[PDB]
Amino acid sequence: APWKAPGPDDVRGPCPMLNTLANHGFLPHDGKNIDVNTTVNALSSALNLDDELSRDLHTFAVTTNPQPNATWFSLNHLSRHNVLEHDASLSRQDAYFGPPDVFNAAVFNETKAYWTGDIINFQMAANALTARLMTSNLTNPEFSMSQLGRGFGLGETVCYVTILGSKETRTVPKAFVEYLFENERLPYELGFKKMKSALTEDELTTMMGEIYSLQHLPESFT
Amino acid sequence: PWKAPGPDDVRGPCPMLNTLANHGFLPHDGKNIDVNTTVNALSSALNLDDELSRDLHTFAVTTNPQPNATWFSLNHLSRHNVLEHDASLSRQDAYFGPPDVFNAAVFNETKAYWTGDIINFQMAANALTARLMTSNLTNPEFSMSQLGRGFGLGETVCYVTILGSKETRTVPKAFVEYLFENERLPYELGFKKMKSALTEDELTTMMGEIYSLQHLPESFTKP
Amino acid sequence: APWKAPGPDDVRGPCPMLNTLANHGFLPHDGKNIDVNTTVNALSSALNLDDELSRDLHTFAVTTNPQPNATWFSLNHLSRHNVLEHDASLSRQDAYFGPPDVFNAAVFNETKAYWTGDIINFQMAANALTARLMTSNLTNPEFSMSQLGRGFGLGETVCYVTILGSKETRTVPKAFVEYLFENERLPYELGFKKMKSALTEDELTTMMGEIYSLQHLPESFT
Amino acid sequence: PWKAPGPDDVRGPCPMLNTLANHGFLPHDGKNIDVNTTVNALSSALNLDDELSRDLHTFAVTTNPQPNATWFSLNHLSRHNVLEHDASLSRQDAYFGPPDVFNAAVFNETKAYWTGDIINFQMAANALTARLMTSNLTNPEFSMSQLGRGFGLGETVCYVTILGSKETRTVPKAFVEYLFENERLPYELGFKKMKSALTEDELTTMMGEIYSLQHLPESFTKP
Numbered sequence: 088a089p090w091k092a093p094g095p096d097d098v099r100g101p102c103p104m105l106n107t108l109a110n111h112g113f114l115p116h117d118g119k120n121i122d123v124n125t126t127v128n129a130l131s132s133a134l135n136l137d138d139e140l141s142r143d144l145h146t147f148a149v150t151t152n153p154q155p156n157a158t159w160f161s162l163n164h165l166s167r168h169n170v171l172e173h174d175a176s177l178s179r180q181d182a183y184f185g186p187p188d189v190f191n192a193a194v195f196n197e198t199k200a201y202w203t204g205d206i207i208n209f210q211m212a213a214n215a216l217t218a219r220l221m222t223s224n225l226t227n228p229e230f231s232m233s234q235l236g237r238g239f240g241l242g243e244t245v246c247y248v249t250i251l252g253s254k255e256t257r258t259v260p261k262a263f264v265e266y267l268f269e270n271e272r273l274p275y276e277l278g279f280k281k282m283k284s285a286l287t288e289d290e291l292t293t294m295m296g297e298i299y300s301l302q303h304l305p306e307s308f309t
Numbered sequence: 310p311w312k313a314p315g316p317d318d319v320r321g322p323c324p325m326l327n328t329l330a331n332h333g334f335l336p337h338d339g340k341n342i343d344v345n346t347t348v349n350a351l352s353s354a355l356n357l358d359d360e361l362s363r364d365l366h367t368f369a370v371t372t373n374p375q376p377n378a379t380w381f382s383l384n385h386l387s388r389h390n391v392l393e394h395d396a397s398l399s400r401q402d403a404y405f406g407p408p409d410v411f412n413a414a415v416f417n418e419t420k421a422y423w424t425g426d427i428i429n430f431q432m433a434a435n436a437l438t439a440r441l442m443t444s445n446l447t448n449p450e451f452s453m454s455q456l457g458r459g460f461g462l463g464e465t466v467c468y469v470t471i472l473g474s475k476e477t478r479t480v481p482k483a484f485v486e487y488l489f490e491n492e493r494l495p496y497e498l499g500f501k502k503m504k505s506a507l508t509e510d511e512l513t514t515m516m517g518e519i520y521s522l523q524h525l526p527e528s529f530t531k532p
Numbered sequence: 533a534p535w536k537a538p539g540p541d542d543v544r545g546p547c548p549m550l551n552t553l554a555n556h557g558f559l560p561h562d563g564k565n566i567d568v569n570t571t572v573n574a575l576s577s578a579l580n581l582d583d584e585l586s587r588d589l590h591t592f593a594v595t596t597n598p599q600p601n602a603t604w605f606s607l608n609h610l611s612r613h614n615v616l617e618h619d620a621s622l623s624r625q626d627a628y629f630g631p632p633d634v635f636n637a638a639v640f641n642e643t644k645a646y647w648t649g650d651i652i653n654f655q656m657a658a659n660a661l662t663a664r665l666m667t668s669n670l671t672n673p674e675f676s677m678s679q680l681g682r683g684f685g686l687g688e689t690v691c692y693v694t695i696l697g698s699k700e701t702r703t704v705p706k707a708f709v710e711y712l713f714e715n716e717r718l719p720y721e722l723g724f725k726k727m728k729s730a731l732t733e734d735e736l737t738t739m740m741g742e743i744y745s746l747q748h749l750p751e752s753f754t
Numbered sequence: 755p756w757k758a759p760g761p762d763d764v765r766g767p768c769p770m771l772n773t774l775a776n777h778g779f780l781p782h783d784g785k786n787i788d789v790n791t792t793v794n795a796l797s798s799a800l801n802l803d804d805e806l807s808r809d810l811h812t813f814a815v816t817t818n819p820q821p822n823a824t825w826f827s828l829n830h831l832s833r834h835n836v837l838e839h840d841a842s843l844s845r846q847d848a849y850f851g852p853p854d855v856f857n858a859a860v861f862n863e864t865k866a867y868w869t870g871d872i873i874n875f876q877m878a879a880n881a882l883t884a885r886l887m888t889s890n891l892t893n894p895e896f897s898m899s900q901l902g903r904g905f906g907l908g909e910t911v912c913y914v915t916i917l918g919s920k921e922t923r924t925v926p927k928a929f930v931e932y933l934f935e936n937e938r939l940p941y942e943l944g945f946k947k948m949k950s951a952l953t954e955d956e957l958t959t960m961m962g963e964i965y966s967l968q969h970l971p972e973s974f975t976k977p
């Protein structure tokens with residue numbers, strides 16, 4: 088598949104998947120001026136997400152554009168700390184410790200430890216998210232996790248399992264996920280093909296609850 | 310054979326010594342255990358090396374309140390922050406409740422990190438890491454000395470390699486759940502004691518291995 | 533593929549591949565009384581080795597049978613230290629430290645470190661063998677490595693790369709090799725199919741020289 | 755710009771300081787380097803944090819034979835078993851030859867462990883492990899104190915993360931080969947100094963990471 092790394096005047100953000108889609112040219116390769124038609128059609132073409140889900144993700148995205156009531160966004164808008172970006176990411180530093188947009192191999196090394204099989208299931212995904220939340224809470228004196236941010240993390244975890252893998256079996260090959268994060272390239276060469284049955288909002292919300300139910304966080308946690 | 314403990318039979322915070330008492334390898338009432346009793350029990354039931362068993366006994370007797378004692382009883386082992394410590398896999402922290410008896414809610418956290426039918430060292434490291442972070446975040450009196458940290462590493466190596474294989478560094482998950490939940494050796498699941506006795510040097514090496522696979526904060530207590 | 537773990541009265545040896553072939557029933561599942569017809573036909577059927585190579589491997593094997601001039605062997609005969617079995621194995625302890633027949637995860641952990649890619653090439657294989665030789669030399673006060681034993685190690689390394697992988701490209705997927713060693717099961721479920729062009733003795737000998745040329749051992753080494 | 759060293763220009767065992775002298779970040783003759791010169795050179799050429807640069811200077815001046823010196827020259831750094839040590843990646847052990855100049859045969863061993871076009875921390879750990887074992891097996895005067903062991907870890911973290919990325923913990927192999935073989939910064943290969951300055955704490959953390967990926971004997975010197 089066509090793919091090109093970002094250059095000096097291209098922008099990227101904290102989302103491994105949107106970065107990947109820009110690298111492949113499903114989104115503008117420069118990462119800029121992403122309109123709602125582009126978002127819906129890109130997420131459909133690359134990943135077979137349902138339009139409603141894609142449109143709602145776009146609606147979230149444009150809240151990071153500093154222009155009031157904007158209808159578009161750019162990938163670097165997404166990076167601003169504690170808007171959509173949050174602490175306890177799986178592959179990025181907390182803003183307190185470093186720029187929270189770029190891939191960090193040490194953070195990802197922690198996450199990967201909890202993927203203790205060739206196939207990632209929801210318990211493993213829940214464990215990784217729990218670990219990262221506890222690590223941030225213990226080490227970051229500016230740690231914050233709002234109700235919204237907690238929901239964002241649940242959605243992000245459901246997304247890498249079920250959009251790279253199977254919403255039906257709630258599993259994904261570990262290699263697919265490592266490839267996406269480490270390369271910001273879709274794992275086509277490992278055999279990845281987009282899902283046949285489009286992921287809906289209702290399916291995503293249901294599965295977010297499932298991940299939540301498998302986590303083992305302190306009762307006082309958000 | 311196996312017999313449940315009665316109200317006069319003392320037990321402690323160690324799932325394995327409790328189990329050995331229930332089978333009569335140790336005195337069934339859990340009391341007055343001297344070094345020959347410890348060594349015979351660990352050798353006969355589990356084929357630990359005698360040097361390791363003797364050194365474990367030496368640790369155990371430090372929990373006896375009586376000075377210059379050469380023996381201990383299982384309830385002595387429950388004394389908080391002598392050999393017993395926070396972030397146990399199957400017991401409550403002493404701050405929250407009695408730290409001797411099995412606690413299903415705590416064990417449910419631990420089991421979540423044992424992802425397959427076979428537990429490996431990464432899974433075991435993950436469970437210990439999670440329990441340490443949970444205690445640190447929830448217990449306002451949490452303590453974990455370098456000594457306690459080392460104790461936890463030893464305990465984790467013990468359930469994997471004494472119920473399982475030091476050679477493959479794995480154990481069937483069902484063996485471990487059976488020991489903790491029943492305090493009975495998993496004979497009926499096929500368990501047979503190791504052919505090659507576990508030595509102190511092997512245990513020490515494997516403690517470092519578990520440590521190396523954990524993902525705790527860099528500032529977190531080291532063993 | 534049919535496969536069964538060994539039971540109490542089955543015997544196994546220090547060779548991960550012969551153990552595997554017994555588990556699949558290409559060799560007698562009990563590991564006993566392996567005649568030359570069985571060896572040649574099993575290595576052909578499972579792995580497509582040339583008959584001459586298989587016959588010569590059998591001729592080596594029977595030297596471990598304590599019966600003088602035996603025409604057959606059993607897998608546990610192979611384990612006897614410093615006959616065909618040698619120090620600096622990739623997945624077994626040196627005899628000085630432990631029984632040198634069974635898989636050891638700590639030894640294999642060292643070996644695997646040198647397979648620094650998803651595809652193992654000859655430089656990586658040479659590096660792993662070099663590392664294990666140096667580790668044994670440094671730690672084992674009874675370390676021995678004869679000229680024959682050194683040759684045996686070269687052959688063993690060429691075998692896991694080119695019999696699980698490709699003699700043509702001199703590479704093998706790392707996952708195939710890890711699967712064979714850790715499971716003593718052929719990596720069929722990962723996509724393994726035996727080579728189309730049978731491996732010959734001449735090819736093996738040539739490639740043994742290639743591995744040798746890529747190693748970085750002390751000049752004083754055997 | 756870059757200028758080769760002449761016969762009056764002293765050089766030492768550090769590929770990077772030699773390189774910085776060749777580019778004139780350090781005095782081209784390699785002499786009389788004070789703390790402001792060190793800090794300016796490391797900041798301007800490589801964007802190291804100033805605290806790290808100052809502490810590196812403090813190490814460097816211990817190699818000056820003159821007591822109470824606040825400066826050093828590059829050849830001072832070559833003094834065996836002060837900061838210079840055995841099992842270097844690109845230099846001979848002092849027992850076998852001068853331990854300051856680049857040695858292609860030694861570097862050929864090191865490069866063998868850099869298996870792809872990109873060097874990661876496992877590859878770097880492997881190269882260091884191999885060189886340590888080679889020196890131990892071949893040099894009858896081999897020495898590796900805990901201090902020297904730590905020095906080696908720091909040097910390995912430095913070529914990966916100062917030429918490459920501390921964020922991804924990788925570097926292009928060609929950048930590293932270019933620095934060692936030419937003692938010239940690999941500008942023509944696309945190298946640009948890091949945007950986020952490397953700190954002492956980051957370096958220390960990554961030294962522990964390299965250590966954790968090495969496969970040395972359990973008895974081998976620890977940092």
Ligand code: HEM
Binds near residue numbers: 103126175
């Ligand atoms: C317009 C659509 C999308 C938007 C606006 C968006 C936005 C974001 C943002 C702002 C973050 C950073 C949160 C943080 O970790 O601090 C993020 C992370 C993430 N996104 Fe997206 N995303 C989109 C689509 C997708 C899709 C389709 C996937 C499918 C795999 C995905 C997977 C992820 C994952 C797994 C993370 C977590 C990264 C980490 O924790 O290191 N995203 N996304």
Ligand code: HEM
Binds near residue numbers: 365386395397398471
């Ligand atoms: C004389 C020998 C022994 C002594 C004195 C001893 C002592 C103890 C003590 C005091 C604890 C409580 C630590 C804590 O979790 O707070 C403990 C826990 C533990 N012991 Fe032992 N033990 C002995 C032998 C064994 C053996 C042979 C095994 C083999 C499986 C074993 C497995 C464990 C495990 C897995 C724990 C952790 C339980 C948990 O975290 O919930 N112990 N032991």
Ligand code: HEM
Binds near residue numbers: 546589611
């Ligand atoms: C009749 C045929 C064979 C015989 C007699 C034989 C014998 C042996 C013996 C005695 C060893 C132990 C050497 C040691 O590591 O100490 C060994 C190891 C080994 N064998 Fe075989 N083998 C045969 C066929 C094969 C085949 C077809 C393969 C193909 C992959 C293979 C792969 C290996 C490997 C990779 C090792 C090294 C194990 C290690 O170092 O941990 N062998 N073999």
Ligand code: HEM
Binds near residue numbers: 767770771910
């Ligand atoms: C004032 C700052 C520095 C001082 C005093 C210093 C000192 C030294 C010394 C004495 C050695 C020889 C150790 C040995 O291999 O025996 C050395 C080696 C080394 N230095 Fe530096 N160094 C400095 C800065 C740097 C920087 C900024 C880098 C970044 C790439 C670097 C990279 C290396 C490497 C990779 C080696 C190992 C060479 C080998 O093993 O062949 N150094 N340094």
Ligand SMILES: [Mg+2]
Binds near residue numbers: 173175187
């Ligand atoms: Mg974040």
Ligand SMILES: [Mg+2]
Binds near residue numbers: 322
């Ligand atoms: Mg406790």
Ligand SMILES: [Mg+2]
Binds near residue numbers: 619624625626632
């Ligand atoms: Mg061997």
Ligand SMILES: [Mg+2]
Binds near residue numbers: 838839840841842
């Ligand atoms: Mg040196």
